[PDB]
Structure formats: C-alpha cells, structure tokens
C-alpha cells in the first residue's frame, strides 16, 4: 500500500465537475512521488466568523480539514464568493508553514492577505470587489478585454524554486484568463519584504509569479499550470505542493 497525502483544497464546494483538471494534476503529482491523494473540499465560506456564528458544526468541521492539511491550496476560481475565507485559509498557511499554491485569483488574493498583514497596509484591496477601492493593489488591466491562449511568462531571476521545477528554464509558456492584475504603482512597497515578485509577462507589466522567501514552498501564480499537466510531466507548480507537502523537496 501507499503512504497517504492530505490535500487541502479551499474553494467553492466535493468534486464538482470544473475541478477536474485542478485533480488530475494534483493526482500525477501524488503519482509521482508514490503517495496516495487524500483530497479535502473546503467551501470557503465556511471558514469565515459569519459560519461560527450560524453554523458552528460547519465551521469546526472545516477547520480541522485545513489543520490537519500537509498542504493547501486556493484555485482560480472566479468570484467574489468565499473570498473571506480563502484570506483565512491564506494567513494559515503563511503563518503556519504550511506548503501553499495560489493559481490565478488564489495569487492575487495572496498578495492583498501579505500587504495586509505584513506590510500593514490595512485597506490594501481589489478593485475588481471595491471599484472605489482607496488602496487599489489589484487593478484592471486588460489588453488593448482578457489576457487568454497559450502565453510567455519570464524569470526576472535564478533564485527561484519554480524555476528550479520547470529546469531552469528562462521562460515558461501556460494557459491564461485573466485581466486582474499586480498594480505597478504598489510594487515598490515590497521591496525588502520576503515575497518576491519572480516572473512576468513579456512586457514587464504584470507579475505572473510570487513566492516567499522562510517558507518552505509558498507559491502564487497567474496563469493555471493545470492545463498542460500529464501523468509522466506533472505540473510543476502542483509537483512542488506535493514534494513540500511530503517533505521530499530538498532530495529533488
């Protein structure tokens, strides 16, 4: 038999069906490194202080599937719904040294919940939630309509875990939807913080990849690296959750 891997994936639901791909990635990883998936569906909300209040069973339920998780991840799922919770889920694994992925609003999200809570810009948003938002962190941004197809994300060094997974690449090519982005105009407040902005677009207007620095693996990332895994080439980044969810990083 296999050693067991637990999974903690914070969204909206069980495996409902546009989870699919997001399984079949996390499943090669697993795969890979010879552990069985145990995989736990979290809908987000019930993390939050409003399910304590009114659902109490509920919302000790879900949070000792989040803290009894070897790693967690936030999908890119689209909305405004759970996004509290997600935040919750976040600073848990961030503070905690839980391995952590982020993929698309996962990243964004990410980013606001450090500007919040280790740069103290307390009001840091989204105005994709808030369009009046006072400290607009993430901001529309759309090509001139929505960042789509097959594209090119660039390192902007070697320092870098992700890197490291994809082969030392200096450029990787993923599938994208999105229009949300990092705001330039924000981006020096992190300079000597420990999140580091490390890929781009080819433009150098969007940061497309995150990752903290005393963490074991915390990563964000824009695209959704789902979309181009297989049984004999994981995903990286969903191939790095699982190797640090496992404690197997270091060895490969």
């Known amino acids: 038999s296999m050693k067991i891997c637990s999974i903690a994936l914070v969204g909206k639901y069980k495996l409902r069906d546009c989870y699919a791909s997001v399984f079949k990635a996390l499943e090669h990883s697993a795969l890979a490194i010879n552990h069985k998936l145990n995989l736990m ?5 019930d993390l939050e202080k409003i399910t304590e209040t009114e659902d109490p069973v509920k919302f000790h339920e879900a949070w000792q599937k989040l803290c009894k998780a070897d790693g967690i991840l936030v999908p890119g799922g689209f909305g405004i719904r759970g996004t509290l919770g997600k935040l919750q889920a976040i600073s848990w694994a961030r503070t905690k040294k839980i391995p952590f992925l982020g993929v698309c609003l996962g990243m964004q999200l990410a980013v606001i919940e450090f500007a919040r809570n280790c740069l103290n810009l307390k009001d840091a948003d989204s105005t994709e939630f808030r369009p009046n938002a006072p400290v607009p962190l993430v901001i529309d941004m759309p090509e ?11 390192f902007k060094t070697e320092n870098s875990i992700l890197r490291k997974l994809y082969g030392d690449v200096p450029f990787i090519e993923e599938r994208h939807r999105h229009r949300f982005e990092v705001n330039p105009n924000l981006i020096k407040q992190f300079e000597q913080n420990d999140l580091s902005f490390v890929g781009q677009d080819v433009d150098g207007d969007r940061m497309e990849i995150i990752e903290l620095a005393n963490h074991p693996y915390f990563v964000g990332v824009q695209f959704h690296p789902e979309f181009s895994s297989r049984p004999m080439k994981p995903s990286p980044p969903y191939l790095g959750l699982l190797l640090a969810a496992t404690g197997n990083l270091n060895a490969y």
């Open 144 to 154: 001139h309509t929505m960042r789509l197809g097959i594209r090119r994300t660039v």
């Open 41 to 45: 569906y979290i809908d987000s909300i």
